[PDB]
RNA sequence: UAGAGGAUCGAAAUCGAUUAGAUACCGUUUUAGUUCUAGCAGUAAACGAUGCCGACUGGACGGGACAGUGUGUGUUGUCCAU
RNA sequence: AUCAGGUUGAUUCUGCCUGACGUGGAUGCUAUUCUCUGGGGCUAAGCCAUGCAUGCUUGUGAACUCUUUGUGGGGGAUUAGCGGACGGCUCAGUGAUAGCACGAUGAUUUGUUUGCGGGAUGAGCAGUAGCUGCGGGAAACUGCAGAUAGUGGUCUGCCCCUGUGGGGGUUGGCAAGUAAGUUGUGGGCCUAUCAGCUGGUAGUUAGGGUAAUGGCCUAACUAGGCGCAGACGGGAUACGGGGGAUCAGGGUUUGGUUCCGGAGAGGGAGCCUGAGAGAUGGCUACUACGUCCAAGGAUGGCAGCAGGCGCGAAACUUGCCUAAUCCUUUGGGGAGGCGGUUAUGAGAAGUGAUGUGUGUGCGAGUGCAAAGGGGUCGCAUGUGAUUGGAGGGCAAGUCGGGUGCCAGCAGCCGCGGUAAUACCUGCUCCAAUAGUGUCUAUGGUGGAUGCUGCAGUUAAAAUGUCCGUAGUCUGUGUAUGUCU
């Protein structure tokens, strides 16, 4: 975390989408929506990747934008 | 520098309810409405009046039915919703405050300009009236009214006509 | 400087003070003026509203009144013999209000000869040594002058037991 | 915030002046002088909103710098000068006279009068003092008058000359008189005294309109303007200060509601 | 914790059995403790797992105390309705 | 004034978890028009290049200048006066010393405004700005000589307190109005793993200081003052109100932000002028960071309007204005107005139609300080839908093809192992529509905090037993007319 220097893990949602990111990339994460608990069968992760270098991850998967 | 504004419509308490989705699809069909926002505008209009009539009957303040009773009966008569009541008899009024509660949402959708250019025969159907109200071809005795939601008045209803300077006119 | 606000005092229950303001010229004060005897010196100070006080730094020649006859005379100030609050103000010859001074007796030479050496014999004994006692009822640091009256009878005996 | 303010925002202007909510952010600030601050209107509004003479402010200051106005028979050239109740405004060219009044809606009102009525003023006596070997009395618009009767006290109404500024005669308050209410809940209403009672250092006047309605008010919000119901000392406005209630206003437009 | 006492039983320790193994159930040798006096401590399925006080409400068969004489007052056990 | 899904082989419960409706902030895809209303508060009361945000009026008339010329004129430097204490920005400090409500000032001062009162044309000496010359210094700033208005002393007179002596002052006033200072009582932020606290501390008597009351300050003396009806402490994202959101009733939550009140100008202190300042687009010192120099010196204050860097998930133009509104009303004004920029909110019209385009473009006139726009006319002209879903909750497909407990989906229950109505891809349909989804905080939902109005044998919960002080209850603080 650039703001506080804490380590966290986050979950990369869609199909085949973990392969756009590289190491030393920047990413925007946000909550899951359930008050600070985990959701579903995912143990220990409380966050969720949203963007990848200022581009929406959901738009790269639907084909509206182009990879970084 | 004025006001922020305010909201005219509301929203249903439950989105997907079939006994409510069946009768709303009729009203936007029979009157040619444009979306559901127009219909919830008119529901709130019609519901303000009922909540106004009930308080006027259970009122112990003896000087209420005179002032505010007949005030709300004049306002309805001006628009063509209620008939004609002798506003001088204490019993002929309190029966008029019992006919305000037995109303429809059709007594309001029918005092509206898109439906008045249809009853007074000037258009094929309610999809043509909207097409030549917006085209500036209707005139309420002097005025080129242009918005198809203008709620006509009783003493101004028969004066509708074409626009004497429009392509549907003589000049 | 001196400032007469009370924002820095402990509260009625004993609680420590909390200050949330700088001092204001509204409530500014002065250091005490200390009027001594000798060679008149008075100064005019400019106060709120543009007005004027007179601050005496040294004074001679009080303006005293003999009560039994009701006449003012101007006498000369000799020394201070009693102050009701601080007797460190007597060792310095400082003239505040209600201090008792020893005054010169010549200008009252006509007045004192309407009293016998009968019930007031202590007023006639000090007159022959050359002095009388008086008391100040003005405020020399606020108006710039000394002004009082001479002690006789009840007063002169009450105070005489103080300064011996 | 220990120094005086010199501006007025327009939201805070008094309701009696009838100023539009928009139309700028500021309003004219009145000056000190004759009447209180909650009981006056600036001179410059009376010449451009209540007479509509000047349409501008370049023009309004051509009418005042050419010396065409006289408040209480005395030339005024300042647009911040304050004008109060029962004051005469004269305009030489196009000879006219007005008196400053209230409505029954409690707004201001300019009432046209004649020329031998424009030599008057009515005020109350409020203070009384002696200085330098002369006895004085103080008006409610703020003036001192010297060498009046020795039998004028606090509360009486006096008539000022307005062209020599000297008392003419007065009125003592008592039953069967007339009243104008200059402030309070009941501002702009004329009545006729019926009873005068007291309370914890107060005097309250039971009154009765010129139509039968009843009434009551302290003695600090009332000026006597008459000796009896047909001996009033000024000319009242068109409606005389009735204030018909809201039951009696719909029957005019709608008739009665009989059983 | 201090003094006194010591029949019986018995943690801990110890052997003999049983068992695949039993540091256990069963048994033999043998202790602290179990008792009294003076104190410390302050816990329990310290349970009817059921605050305290006041007003009103059907039957049947009983018990314990007092007073009367064919019943009453305070307590209390069992069984049937509403 | 409303409920649904989820513990079991099936049942009735207890109990929470999740869905369904609003509102404030940030963010994804997608966008035609106009009208009103908003926009570097949260993190950094962090640091700032350049431009602008404060100057006027004369009963004052220098240099210079004109006239055929004299108690003559032009000219405009400086004196004298008024203002710069308001307006604008921000929310660090402050939990009541501030703010709101009702009171006291008989304890006080007040320029400009209004109406009354009041005013040295005497002597005699000193002497200055501008101006005319000689000059210093990198700079920023400054000296000496010469000669003149206003002016400054001292006598004289005038006024004040006294008088069978004397001693002060140099014209300063009264009443309204406006403003300001001082002061009494009362109010639900959380906390007892905060229970005893207080030395100018509580009072008396005298004096000083102040515009004015008062331990405000000093000298002497008395031993007081507050507290489970919560004192004294400590914590959290504490500026107070007017106000906002939610919504049967009763309640819960929030207010940096237009209007009114306060406080502050990197941090602390101390002051001058003035009717008014403990002033920061005033001065002096210490302290954080600095900047310019010829090295000896001299200097800085955007939480004013634009703008830049930094910080962060997070926020516009280095534009035009001698017009409206007002202050100081042809002087001055980044106050304020006028556009531009941006899915801030709210309202109103469109994306076509058969008899005879609700759009876009241009032209007149209107409008303005100058222009945009808009609405009244004409000329051509013809363009303009998305976002989220289809097993149940919950409106809508056992439709085609791929994948085979993989890849992925799913708030919750759950789906996928070659027989997928739930994943990926194509069609078809559903809801709302210039919008529609996601993350975060909060009201309702919740009789799941219970005053109205819950529960306590066994589901979470009556204390091992008696006695007993404060408090509550019992025994012996109300309603209403009139005025404010």
Curated annotation (Swiss-Prot), chain A:
The lineage of its organism: Eukaryota, Fungi, Fungi incertae sedis, Microsporidia, Unikaryonidae. This is Small ribosomal subunit protein uS12. It comes from Encephalitozoon cuniculi (strain GB-M1) (Microsporidian parasite). The gene is RPS23. Belongs to the universal ribosomal protein uS12 family.
From Swiss-Prot, chain B:
The keyword rRNA processing applies. GO terms for molecular function: rRNA binding; structural constituent of ribosome. InterPro entries: Ribosomal_uS4, Ribosomal_uS4_euk/arc, S4_RNA-bd_sf. Residues 111-171 form the S4 RNA-binding domain. GO terms for cellular component: cytosolic small ribosomal subunit; nucleolus. Keywords: Cytoplasm, Nucleus, Ribonucleoprotein, Ribosomal protein, Ribosome biogenesis, RNA-binding, rRNA processing, rRNA-binding. The keyword rRNA-binding applies. It comes from the Eukaryota. Disulfide bonds: none annotated. It is found in: Cytoplasm; Nucleus, Nucleolus. One of its GO terms (biological process) is ribosomal small subunit biogenesis. Belongs to the universal ribosomal protein uS4 family. Involved in nucleolar processing of pre-18S ribosomal RNA and ribosome assembly. PANTHER family: 30S 40S RIBOSOMAL PROTEIN, 40S RIBOSOMAL PROTEIN S9. Component of the small ribosomal subunit. This is Small ribosomal subunit protein uS4. It comes from Encephalitozoon cuniculi (strain GB-M1). The gene is RPS9.
From Swiss-Prot, chain D:
One of its GO terms (biological process) is translation. Pfam families: Ribosomal_S4e, RS4NT. GO terms for cellular component: cytosolic small ribosomal subunit. Keywords: Cytoplasm, Ribonucleoprotein, Ribosomal protein, RNA-binding, rRNA-binding. It is found in: Cytoplasm. It comes from the Eukaryota. Residues 41-104 form the S4 RNA-binding domain. InterPro entries: Rib_uL2_dom2, Ribosomal_eS4, Ribosomal_eS4_central_region, Ribosomal_eS4_central_sf, Ribosomal_eS4_N, S4_RNA-bd_sf. One of its GO terms (molecular function) is structural constituent of ribosome. Gene3D superfamilies: 2.30.30.30, 2.40.50.740, RNA-binding S4 domain. Component of the small ribosomal subunit. Belongs to the eukaryotic ribosomal protein eS4 family. This is Small ribosomal subunit protein eS4. The lineage of its organism: Eukaryota, Fungi, Fungi incertae sedis, Microsporidia, Unikaryonidae.
